[PDB]
């Protein structure tokens, strides 16, 4: 009964770093002087799409790793962490047959028993998996280079686009799902499907490099990025609100106790402390 946990690289929720030469993780401390809890997470090294993937042990830490450690202690389970083989969160695509990719596919195929990541709760995924009660409430916003003038989601450069102002999201993500479903955003969706990125880090870098004019993504990630990279800014408020949850198969025997532990952590200040440690500052 050793749980296979799947995660994804996504600062500040999941930091991914190489192990030291001896295969251990570098000893680090917060501003509070408390040791940083780290876990060994196996995963492929960064490679282009359609290439062989070579799996190696890596170091994982962050909000979601601290949360996993607390759940494992409370519910008394052991685990092994791995990074999603295709590097994606997960969407359902047509192959008559339909298949889930990313962490969604891994959980549904039994490659993982639990998704512990900044995984958006939405109708499309809830039809197939069980989400816990949310551990974080946030939404969608837009990241731009300081000096770029966007009013927000209703900016004409977004609603009536051209090849002059390039905006995108991350492929096979909840944002991709949102824009594909909402017919009112179809003009935006068609522009984005031409420029979508393989990962949030690549998209953030492209904004810095002036290769991407606007990146549409999770506010919990974009506000953290803007607070560290002062050449980047978020534009406006949230145009949509969504929460993150733990993902499990519908027949999981841990489902009720995962949600009770999450509720206990919201009520006793534990989740607020994690938020202050990782997501704020």
């Amino acid at each position: 009964t050793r749980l296979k946990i799947v995660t994804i690289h996504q600062e500040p929720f999941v930091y991914v770093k190489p192990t030291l030469s001896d295969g251990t993780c570098k000893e680090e401390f917060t501003v509070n002087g408390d040791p940083v809890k780290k876990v060994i997470c196996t995963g492929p090294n960064d490679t282009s799409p359609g290439s062989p993937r070579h799996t190696v042990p890596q170091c994982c830490y962050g909000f979601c790793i601290d949360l996993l450690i607390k759940l494992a202690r409370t519910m008394n389970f052991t685990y092994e962490v791995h990074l999603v083989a295709d590097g994606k969160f997960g969407t359902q695509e047509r192959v008559n047959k339909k298949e889930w990719n990313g962490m969604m596919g891994e959980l549904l195929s039994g490659q993982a028993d639990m998704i512990v990541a900044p995984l958006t709760i939405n109708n499309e995924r809830a039809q197939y998996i069980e989400f816990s009660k949310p551990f974080k409430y946030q939404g969608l916003t837009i990241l731009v280079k300081k000096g770029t003038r966007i009013t927000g989601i209703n900016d004409p450069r977004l609603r009536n686009p051209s090849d002059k102002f390039i905006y995108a999201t991350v492929k096979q993500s909840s944002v991709d799902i949102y824009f594909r479903r909402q017919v009112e955003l179809s003009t935006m969706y068609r522009h984005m499907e031409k420029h979508n990125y393989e990962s949030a880090a690549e998209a953030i870098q492209a904004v810095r490099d002036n290769k991407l004019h606007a990146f549409i993504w999770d506010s919990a990630v974009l506000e953290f990025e803007a607070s560290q990279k002062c050449d980047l800014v978020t534009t406006g408020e949230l145009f949509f609100r969504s929460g993150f949850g733990i993902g499990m198969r519908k027949d999981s025997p841990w489902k009720q106790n995962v949600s009770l532990s999450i509720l206990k952590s919201h009520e006793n200040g534990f989740m607020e402390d994690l938020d202050k440690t990782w997501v704020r500052y």
Binding site: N122, A126, F131, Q182, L260, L263, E267, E272
Partner: protein
Amino acid sequence: NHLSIVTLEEAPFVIVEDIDPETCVRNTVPCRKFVKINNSTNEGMNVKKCCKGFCIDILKKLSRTVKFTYDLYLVTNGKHGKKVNNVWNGMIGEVVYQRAVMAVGSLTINEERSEVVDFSVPFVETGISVMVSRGTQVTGLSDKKFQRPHDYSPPFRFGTVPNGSTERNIRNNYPYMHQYMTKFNQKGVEDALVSLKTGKLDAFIYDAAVLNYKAGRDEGCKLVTIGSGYIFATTGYGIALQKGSPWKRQIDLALLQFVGDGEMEELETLWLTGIC
């Protein structure tokens, strides 16, 4: 698929009105309330009333999408839900003891209630907020004025409305603050707001969604929530269903669909916006 549903009045989530001169019209739905004939009898009458509000519009949308009809009634044994001598009263109790298939209203999701009922996904964010007169200097629930109140001359005067999720959280987390506060218990939100406005109270600690609505509608924008609407012990309002309910799957998916297609945002604009 004709379901017994329980609610509780708490504006703007659930608003109760007298029936017309003799059915429910406009954006209202029929809701009944058991009213005693006197105090020397168990005899009473179900009084036909009309219900409206943010949670009622959600119920109307769920009834249509999930395909059920309902008999809506107002809880008379307590309010939201409190475990007294290990027995649940209020909306939670109605669901636990199978008098209602579900409870709809300004019902806070918390750990102890989740052990006895299943909750839907949250449809509104809530938790604990602190209401004060504009300018009052408090850092949050951790402020020394709240944690160690007798360290101040005169001590800070603050209270909540007892027996709900807020008092339960305060009792669990801050034992001293809790025993101190009880002398400042408010009968309801309306009494608490009058006590604040007239300087008989320094702070009112209550449900975040209600406080943020009240601060947004305050005459003269005098009463505000600390930390620009900061929410402590974040949770949400959820529909309470019986453990193992066959309705939970469809209710959860419909709620997520309403959020996703903008229907939920339309209801927030209709019921929860304020000038402040």
